[PDB]
Amino acid sequence: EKGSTFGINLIYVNPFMLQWGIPLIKELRSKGYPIQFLTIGAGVPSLEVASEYIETLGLKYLGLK
């Protein structure tokens, strides 16, 4: 429906997925596709990695597992 939102789960232990996925979000977010949040699964990124995810991706909240 018009205005509806959804999130993405990327698996941290699969760095290839991160290598194409993370810049894909930024591209889709810059054009303003209705993405609300990102969940990083199967691990927790470090401070400096998380820092890039928060500031650059125009998300609203971050999923950590």
């Binding site: 429906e1 018009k2 509806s4 939102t5 303003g32 596709y33």
Partner: protein, 128 residues
């Protein structure tokens, strides 16, 4: 305060916030502030020395936000209104405001016609 709005599906930044970003000179008047249905907020800026109204943000019919947007520097003195229209739906609480995209470009061309062309407004002619 709602950070972004909806353009048909996509999330472009809230332009009402962008316009009302405060600088030196601009003056905001609120009327009937304690009753939602008829409240009228009015921006005024310096225009050619004296102080003229530029933006009228108010309610039309129950679920249409009209951002009447005014250029005073015109051909013939008669100030020209750009009716920006925005759907207010209070169910989708995350992003209530969605822009009316139906006949959007044609409202924009209307204003720019009156600023540039002196002829009667008619868009139905072949570009060839």
């Amino acid at each position: 305060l709602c950070s972004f709005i909806t353009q048909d599906k996509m999330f472009v930044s809230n332009p009402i916030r962008k316009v009302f970003k405060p600088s030196q000179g601009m003056v905001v008047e609120i009327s009937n502030g304690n009753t939602s249905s008829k409240t009228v907020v009015t921006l005024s800026e310096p225009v050619q020395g004296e102080l003229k109204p530029t933006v009228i943000l108010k309610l039309l019919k129950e679920n249409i936000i009209q951002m009447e947007m005014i250029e005073n520097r015109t051909m013939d003195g008669k100030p020209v209104s750009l009716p920006l229209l925005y759907n207010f739906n209070p169910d989708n609480g995350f992003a209530p405001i969605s822009e009316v995209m139906e006949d959007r470009n044609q409202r924009i061309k209307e204003m720019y016609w009156k600023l540039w062309i002196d002829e009667p407004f008619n868009l139905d002619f072949d570009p060839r």
